[PDB]
Amino acid sequence: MMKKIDVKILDPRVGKEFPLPTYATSGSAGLDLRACLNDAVELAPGDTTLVPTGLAIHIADPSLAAMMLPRSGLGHKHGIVLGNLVGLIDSDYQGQLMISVWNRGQDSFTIQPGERIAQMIFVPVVQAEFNLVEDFDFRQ
Amino acid sequence: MMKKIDVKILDPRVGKEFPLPTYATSGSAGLDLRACLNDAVELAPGDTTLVPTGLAIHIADPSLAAMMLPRSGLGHKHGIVLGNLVGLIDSDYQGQLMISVWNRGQDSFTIQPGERIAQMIFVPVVQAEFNLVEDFDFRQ
Amino acid sequence: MMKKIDVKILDPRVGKEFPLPTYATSGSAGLDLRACLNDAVELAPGDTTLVPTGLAIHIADPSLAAMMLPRSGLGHKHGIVLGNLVGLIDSDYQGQLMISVWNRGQDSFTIQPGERIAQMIFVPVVQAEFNLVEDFDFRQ
Ligand SMILES: O=c1ccn([C@H]2C[C@H](O)[C@@H](COP(=O)(O)NP(=O)(O)OP(=O)(O)O)O2)c(=O)[nH]1
Ligand SMILES: O=c1ccn([C@H]2C[C@H](O)[C@@H](COP(=O)(O)NP(=O)(O)OP(=O)(O)O)O2)c(=O)[nH]1
Ligand SMILES: O=c1ccn([C@H]2C[C@H](O)[C@@H](COP(=O)(O)NP(=O)(O)OP(=O)(O)O)O2)c(=O)[nH]1
Ligand SMILES: [Mg+2]
Ligand SMILES: [Mg+2]
Ligand SMILES: [Mg+2]
Numbered sequence A, B, C: 001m002m003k004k005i006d007v008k009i010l011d012p013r014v015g016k017e018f019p020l021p022t023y024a025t026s027g028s029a030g031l032d033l034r035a036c037l038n039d040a041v042e043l044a045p046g047d048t049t050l051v052p053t054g055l056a057i058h059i060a061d062p063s064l065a066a067m068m069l070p071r072s073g074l075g076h077k078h079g080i081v082l083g084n085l086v087g088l089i090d091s092d093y094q095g096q097l098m099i100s101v102w103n104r105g106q107d108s109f110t111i112q113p114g115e116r117i118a119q120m121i122f123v124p125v126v127q128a129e130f131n132l133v134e135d136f137d138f139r140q
Helices: A072-078 B072-078 C072-078
Strands: A002-009 A031-034 A041-043 A048-058 A064-069 A080-082 A087-089 A096-103 A109-111 A116-124 A127-132 B002-009 B031-034 B041-043 B048-058 B064-069 B080-082 B087-089 B096-103 B109-111 B116-124 B127-132 C002-009 C031-034 C041-043 C048-058 C064-069 C080-082 C087-089 C096-103 C109-111 C116-124 C127-132
Touching (some): A041 A048, A072 C096, A087 A116, B041 B048, B072 B080, B087 B096, B087 B116, B096 B116, B096 C072, B116 C116, C072 C080, C087 C116
Antiparallel strands (some): A002 A048, A031 A116, A041 A109, A048 A096, A064 A087, A064 A116, B031 B116, B041 B109, B064 B116, B080 B096, C002 C048, C041 C109, C080 C096
């Protein structure tokens, strides 16, 4: 399923020195986000740092949201994941997309400018209206 | 997209002293869940505690599920996330919604009664039936 | 919503000694994945290990993806979660499904052959095409 989404470039390196996010294949679920940084950031074991993307999106349709996730190789092999675990992007959010990078592992890690550091999917979402009722119709 | 969802209030403070979950805007993807507690819970670095919501939902439609996620500010700034990372709520689950709160950071944190401590989205889900086949048609 | 999905068994114990993933009920959102191991793996506090499933899927439809998540009991009570937090499976991925198991807690844990160790949902996904614009129309 395809959707055109408005994007505003906030840093002039985005789309040039720091490529715009892209799907690798026609069958890819997510697209990689790149770190928009002036210099490398050394991230010690256990620490968190806020990484800018240099861009803003406006999903606009309230039936859609985005989720930011770790990349599997970074997470598994290096312990480089998200400090908020999963990032939820609202349809009406127009600010810069930010990435909370958390080193959950035991080795220091260098986050490099332009590096694909996380990924993002767009999923349909449903807004619930609660209907209060008295009765309906936690090894493993 | 909108859906009416049955909710049963299990604690009489929910909808009163502890507001029912609500979307902040018409464009919000998720709604915040509040801690249904009698007193504050001090959560030491590295520990996990089970927080009640005081409510039960019945999604009922097997084409829908919910996912509980950390709130980004709590996760990034305070290390307050979910012990199970992401909570998956089944359409036929009618028990109390529970929140596994994990302090992944280095500072103690007070979980307060009524505090918005996590969030939840409703997403369409597909149930797979596996079709066994011999052949089809893991820095970063 | 239902979808037939092609699966290739890579280990002859899968579907025999190690049951194929199944939904517990007609209302379940996710299905449990079992560890395809020759012997138990002891996973020390803080460590990560790669667990095979002994199977490959081909979702094939680019409007669908899968997400691997921790099981809530394992995550909350034992700290057994995913090293990449959430696993994203692309529609065109035809390799073995692998599970990055991370012990985030304080006690050693034995991963047993055949054990339900994680779960997986199938969700609709949307592929974005970015439309560059000058202007559109981060306690808690
Ligand atoms: O990883 C993230 C998560 C969120 N965000 C942005 C987009 C989202 O729409 C917005 C709010 O997300 P949350 O509701 O998860 N954060 P929080 O509840 O702390 O902030 P707010 O009070 O604005 O709702 O922050 C990011 O840029 N990166
Ligand atoms: O964060 C959560 C996750 C799940 N739940 C509830 C709702 C869900 O439908 C139910 C089962 O979720 P999981 O399958 O993730 N947990 P587990 O596999 O350990 O329990 P079960 O044996 O019941 O499937 O637990 C919560 O209340 N909070
Ligand atoms: O938990 C996971 C996550 C991914 N995978 C597989 C399926 C997925 O389609 C593929 C790629 O996932 P990511 O894009 O999250 N990993 P990474 O970006 O490190 O690898 P690649 O360069 O192949 O995109 O790895 C797993 O088997 N288990
Ligand atoms: Mg990738
Ligand atoms: Mg919020
Ligand atoms: Mg379960």
